[PDB]
Design a protein around this ligand. Structure first.
Ligand SMILES: CCCCCCCCCCCCC/C=C\[C@H](O)[C@H](N)CO
Ligand SMILES: CCCCCCCCCCCCC/C=C\[C@H](O)[C@H](N)CO
Ligand SMILES: *C(=O)CCCCCCCCCCCCC
Ligand SMILES: *C(=O)CCCCCCCCCCCCC
Ligand SMILES: *C(=O)CCCCCCCCCCCCC
Lengths: 268, 235, 283, 60, 8, 283, 235, 60, 60, 60, 8, 8, 8, 8
């Protein structure tokens, strides 16, 4: 644009929340599908849906994590990471069924003298591998759903051996995307790269994806967000550099069915 | 009854056949489709997506995150290679497990143009010019910029546009190449060199990584479906 | 309107360039792949392209019967400690690895199913007796129906379950099945549980397997030898070949790179180093 | 009810045809037609909000 | 017959 | 427009001649063959010709299934030193001589291929035991795919390779294959190497067989008996018959005059005197 | 199902049959033809090409280059034959391995006119008149010019036009002859004689060679395809 | 006779099949229907009728 | 005498048809067409002499 | 989709015909038609740059 | 043929 | 039918 | 076809 | 069809 406008500079507004960025590398719309409400032709539950709109379809910022030379990577699941986020989480636990899309905005700035590259991946049905070699598909619900704080990748598979009282948790090795496939191919999934010399954010617009029109949000996660250091953090000459990564996520076109009393999950 | 004569092939079972057969659940009420995002119609669609090359399969780096990183530095100009690669998309260890390589191991034959894109992951203050080469087969595989220069290449200038793409044009005697190491259908040599050198100011890191990606061009195809060697079930 | 067997695009002739258009330079951070063709970076001649992607269409990729299981039955005399052997198999594509790997290039799928049955038998003892030609019954027992407990109990009446009566030595048996999912597509992967652990309620009750949906998806196949037993013992095996016809797939995934370890994505120690040594500057 | 279609002829000895008839009521019984359509990879290769022009700077 | 025999 | 089965040209009546036209005199140095007909050198009557060249067309010449190989398999108990025998054959037309000679009347060819399989079995020992009817699996393993190492390993799943499951005693098995060459025609002869010996690089590396192109042209056929072994031993043989259909040929060659000696044009000592004694002036 | 009744021939395998069969590689992307020079449509095209006759299969000359050379000389006139040949295109040792003879050994029956062309390879200074004869079967095979003269012949005059063609017209009782030695379908006798004599000046060679070629005329055909005896695989 | 090739599934007996078969009593004089009250066309018609729930399955 | 009908297509790879021909004279030999009709449950669910309006009092 | 052609009748007991139908999609599955064309041998028998007249001197 | 072949 | 049955 | 098939 | 079926 001769009158100013650019790819690198965006403003996103949803509800009472606005995000600005002066160093973007465009935006990604997963599979080229923008979030939408459930159509009558595809509808299944017959009751009048709850649609929270601005009350739930706004930007929630999760806890800032920290990137260092030893970081192997981080992961989150949706809707799980947002389960305690304001009126979205409440509508989620009061209803049997729910569906949502998301705008995911990953934030990581640094300086013209730093370097490093984060791979940001949105994975549909991101089933991760467990820590056991004596039993399979055994990670516990509590261990599988970290909520907002997420989990992390490790560079080494180290099998839980306390057979008497098992850890019952994931053991996601980074070069295998925690699921037995090579990280180098995760680019077939909707993604963006935050390369510190180029951009300071990643923005992904995620449609609702599933084999059902609507499902149990408490039982099932539709999307996994995986962030892995494609190229390690490095700065000037400091042996221990650090920079923050902040995740802000907004539910989009979300609707809920099957109202009752609130679900009080055992999360510990 | 109508006079008939059984021909050869009768009562056999070809696993690649295509006949009708009786339905075991008549009048079953099929659940309709919904419009799920991300539908695929052809395996080649997946080959056209960029995936990251494990360039450094050296003993201590292989099967780890390091294998994806080609380390560069601000060292003085040299005509020696940064990396050397054989254009054997299905058989070369560096390409064989990329998404392109993987799809190619379900087919016996491949054809078309490929493209390698390199991403510079150094700091904004780092500058440099590199040369990316492709040499069609039949001569001494390039070991020095001087040789490499004489074939198909791109001189990449590092700057705002973070990445650079080199296209490896379909240049073959045969109409299709085999998905295995084979001299008759050899494809040539990919190699990368320093054109000038990487230059950084003070207070800046002197070493950095580049990443590489491969994907197929729209003129690429595969044929003769086959089982892969990339999975097995010993017992 | 472009069909899987249409020829691919022609290469167009292109000459020297000296301009500001920069096809070669891009920025993959955006998440996109540079759509370049050879005439963008080299001088090309004109070529009328004949090649097509006909054989790599989704149908063509899966249009093969693949072995999903081997079932063993026999025809011996049921005696106080050991019984005549009939077989029971829980229908799945995950007992073998080859088709499983192919389907798992994708997150979800839809298809009609063609099952073909190959039946082979042999003599287990250094006898000399004989056996007259065997007829096998392959009964489909959907989740909920009475599973057979004996080679000859009432369940084999099959008043409502579909059964195939196969005669030995005839052409392999074959039937078709529609898309039978209770979802709009089959899920190759399910990131969740079939049970919500409820605080208020005891933990043992809240529990369930990770990534497993209905405990019994598609029921089972139960096979038996209909013939009463001979004095001589004959063992038979039934190999099941599965072919997805009229298939649709969604959301592509990287292929399985390390050995399968169970019905889920789990991987076992010592199987995690697939790639082999090869130096950076070695062709 | 016969259905006539043409074969894409490989090695030659006008268009050649083949004939199909469905014998069963259930469409699941039908063979595979192989008359399939191709799509363009855009949704995977270029999932970006702003359309990309390959001759121009990806980032501006 | 005309109708129906469909042709492609 | 002239078809292979049209009648040949009629003989025309011709009378005495006394002229300067000289049909009979020519000069073969030119490389041409004198196109003479009987009415050129003798007095002919008129004859309405009915004969046709229908049976000597290229299709008609090759329209026969010809034996290209015999494969031996068996069904015995795999034991610590010796295993149950499955067979592996590298597809070629050069293991036998008759069709090879016919194809080699030409330099290049193009055709669809029809393979027919005849399977015969027998008892190898002066036993008395029996064996129930055998099912054979014929798997096509294209170059690159996992070759089977055991009669029963994972490769026989054939998720993507084409396999034929043949029942003994049924009509011989048959399939068709398209023109599968990576060239525009098959080369019956290749005057070259698949490798350029490079000075700079060591000799051992530069080397390769004369006249051989891709080390593994068309892959292999792997045959096995699916049945578990009987106590009694049965050996089976699979004869493969090949027929070129829809064939085209280019550049004619003199036929092979001396015994074949290997896959190339090589000839062995002591086989080089084909013609026999017959004196110049002896009818 | 439709009532049917299996007829004789059912489940058999005739190697000369012509049925359809299932394809093992469905949707395979076939490599197109290119326009290669030298395409052949009928084996008889090859029979119409001239190939050199091994006239002299004498014990010391056979299976050597000498077998192709008929030596002449400037010796005085004689009515004795230069060469004698039986018209048994598939079975006579001299014709059986020519390209015509070879194609004929893949068929049981032949019919049509043949033509023998002779090439004089002496010096330009050599002159001469020769007589080339064909005698239809049934009488004493010619041994002297006098007999030979009475049948079909050509008197060849040696000069600038180096070569001479004699046509052996189709003259048969049967509509086709057998491709084996057989009296009922015998074809007759070819023989060559000196009409005058070969004459050379001094300082010129007195002996020289002629070469002979046979090819089929456009009215020639073959039938009943069969295996040849000209190749085998003992073990 | 017409050249034919037996496909897989041949000679099998699927209990859910739907083929024609020869009649054992040809030209039999069938007794016609009368208009009996209470005809049913679909099992779901019966599911739409109210039936009494055994709510108290306590031991006694 | 061929009879052409359409299949209600379940999972897809215009309308698709199948073809039927009756080979036998006796209608008892015929396969089942499955082209069946539905009826409404009224005669079982509402067998009452006076038509019922669901929004009004069942008893008045 | 049936294809009707005529037989060149050998020993006789109007033109006689036979009928063909292709059952498979792949042209490689098709039988051989034997409806082949002949060409003239010129390219092998007379490959000379200057056209030859048989009644005139081959060399002039 | 017209009559045809009845169609539904 | 007319068309579709091709004839030669 | 009309004639095509006779009908009764 | 008319032609296509020849009749005698
Ligand atoms: C007489 C033989 C009858 C055979 C009847 C088989 C009916 C059941 C079909 C099985 C459907 C299996 C489809 C495969 C698995 C699912 O894709 C995954 N678990 C995801 O949902
Ligand atoms: C289940 C049976 C599948 C059988 C599949 C066979 C596919 C491979 C066909 C072999 C092609 C061989 C053609 C002959 C040889 C080549 O002409 C010469 N070496 C010259 O190129
Ligand atoms: C449309 O199908 C009208 C033409 C019918 C042609 C003959 C069909 C061949 C026999 C089919 C019987 C169907 C078996 C269920
Ligand atoms: C109506 O049926 C006219 C069209 C007939 C089509 C061909 C029928 C296929 C063979 C049926 C024979 C009937 C066997 C009793
Ligand atoms: C063109 O084919 C229209 C006429 C069809 C005539 C009946 C065909 C006989 C049965 C063919 C079924 C095809 C099997 C793949």
């Amino acid at each position: 644009e001769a009158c100013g406008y650019s790819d690198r500079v965006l403003q996103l507004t949803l509800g009472n929340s606005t995000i600005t960025t002066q160093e973007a590398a465009n935006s990604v719309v997963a599979y080229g599908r923008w979030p939408e409400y459930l159509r009558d032709s595809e509808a299944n539950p017959v009751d009048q849906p709850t649609e929270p709109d601005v009350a739930a379809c706004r930007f929630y910022t999760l806890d800032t994590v920290s990137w260092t030379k030893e970081s192997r990577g981080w992961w989150w699941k949706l809707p799980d990471a947002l389960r305690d986020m304001g009126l979205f989480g409440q509508n989620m636990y009061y209803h049997y069924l729910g569906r949502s899309g998301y705008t995911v905005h990953v934030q990581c700035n640094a300086s013209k003298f730093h370097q490093g590259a984060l791979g940001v991946f949105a994975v549909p049905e991101m089933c991760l591998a467990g820590d056991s070699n004596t039993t399979t598909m055994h990670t516990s619900y509590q261990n599988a759903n970290p909520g907002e704080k997420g989990g992390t990748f490790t560079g080494t598979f180290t099998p839980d051996n306390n057979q008497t009282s098992p850890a019952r948790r994931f053991c996601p090795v980074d070069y295998l995307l925690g699921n037995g496939t090579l990280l180098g191919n995760a680019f077939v999934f909707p993604h963006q790269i935050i390369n510190l010399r180029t951009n300071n954010c990643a923005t992904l617009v995620l449609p609702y994806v599933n084999s059902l029109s609507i499902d149990s949000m408490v039982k099932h996660n539709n999307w996994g967000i995986a962030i892995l250091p494609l190229a390690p953090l490095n700065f000037a000459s400091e042996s221990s550099p650090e920079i923050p990564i902040t995740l802000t996520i907004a539910p989009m076109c979300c609707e809920f069915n099957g109202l009752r009393n609130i679900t009080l999950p055992r999360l510990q | 009854g109508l006079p008939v004569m059984n021909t050869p092939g009768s009562n056999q079972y070809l696993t690649a056949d295509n006949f009708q057969s009786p339905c075991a659940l008549p009048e079953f009420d099929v659940t309709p489709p919904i419009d799920i995002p991300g539908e695929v119609k052809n395996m080649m669609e997946l080959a056209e997506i960029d995936t990251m090359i494990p360039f450094d399969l050296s003993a201590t780096k292989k099967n780890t995150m390091e294998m994806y990183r080609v380390r560069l530095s601000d060292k003085p100009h040299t005509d020696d290679p940064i990396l050397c690669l054989s254009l054997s998309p299905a058989s070369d260890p560096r390409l064989s497990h990329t998404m392109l390589g993987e799809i190619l191991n379900y087919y016996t034959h491949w054809a078309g143009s490929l493209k390698f894109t390199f991403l510079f992951c150094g700091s904004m203050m780092a500058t440099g010019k590199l040369l990316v080469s492709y040499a069609p087969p039949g001569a001494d595989p390039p070991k020095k910029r001087k040789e490499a220069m004489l074939g198909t290449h791109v001189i990449w200038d590092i700057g705002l546009q973070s990445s650079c793409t080199m296209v490896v044009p379909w240049i073959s005697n045969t109409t299709y190449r085999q998905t295995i190491d084979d001299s008759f259908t050899e494809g040539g040599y990919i190699s990368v060199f320093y054109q000038t050198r990487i230059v950084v100011p003070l207070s800046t890191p002197r070493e950095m990584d580049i990443l590489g990606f491969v994907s197929a061009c729209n003129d690429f195809s595969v044929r003769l479906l086959r089982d892969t060697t990339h999975i097995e079930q010993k017992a | 309107a472009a069909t899987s067997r249409d020829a691919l695009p022609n290469t167009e002739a292109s000459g020297p360039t000296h301009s500001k258009e920069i096809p070669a330079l891009t920025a993959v951070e955006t998440g996109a792949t540079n759509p370049l063709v050879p005439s963008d970076t080299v001088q090309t001649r004109h070529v009328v392209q004949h090649r097509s992607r006909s054989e790599s269409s989704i149908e063509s990729f899966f249009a093969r019967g693949a072995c999903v299981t081997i079932m063993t039955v026999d025809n011996s005399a049921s005696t106080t400690n050991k019984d005549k052997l009939f077989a029971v198999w829980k229908i799945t594509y995950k007992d073998t690895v080859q088709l499983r790997r192919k389907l798992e290039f994708f997150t979800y799928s839809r298809f009609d199913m063609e099952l073909t049955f190959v039946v082979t038998a042999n003599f287990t003892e250094t006898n000399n007796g004989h056996a007259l030609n065997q007829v096998y019954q392959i009964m489909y027992v959907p989740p909920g129906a009475p599973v057979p407990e004996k080679w000859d109990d009432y369940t084999w009446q099959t008043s409502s379950n579909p059964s195939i009566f196969y005669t030995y030595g005839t052409a392999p048996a074959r039937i078709s099945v529609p898309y039978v999912g209770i979802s709009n597509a089959y899920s190759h992967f399910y990131d969740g549980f079939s049970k919500v652990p409820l605080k208020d309620q005891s933990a043992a009750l809240g529990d369930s397997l990770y990534g497993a949906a209905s405990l019994n998806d598609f029921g089972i196949l139960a096979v038996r030898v209909v013939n009463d037993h001979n004095p001589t013992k004959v063992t038979s095996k039934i190999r099941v070949y599965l072919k997805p016809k009229h298939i649709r797939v969604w959301c592509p995934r990287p292929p399985r790179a390390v050995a399968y370890y169970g019905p889920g994505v789990d991987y076992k120690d010592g199987t995690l180093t697939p790639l082999s040594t090869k130096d950076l500057t070695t062709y | 009810g016969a259905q006539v279609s043409s074969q894409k002829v490989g090695a030659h000895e006008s268009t050649i045809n083949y004939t199909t008839i469905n014998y069963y009521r259930d469409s699941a019984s039908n063979a595979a037609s192989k008359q399939d359509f191709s799509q363009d990879p855009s949704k995977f290769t270029e999932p970006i909000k702003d359309v990309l022009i390959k001759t121009a700077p990806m980032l501006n | 017959a005309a109708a129906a025999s469909s042709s492609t």
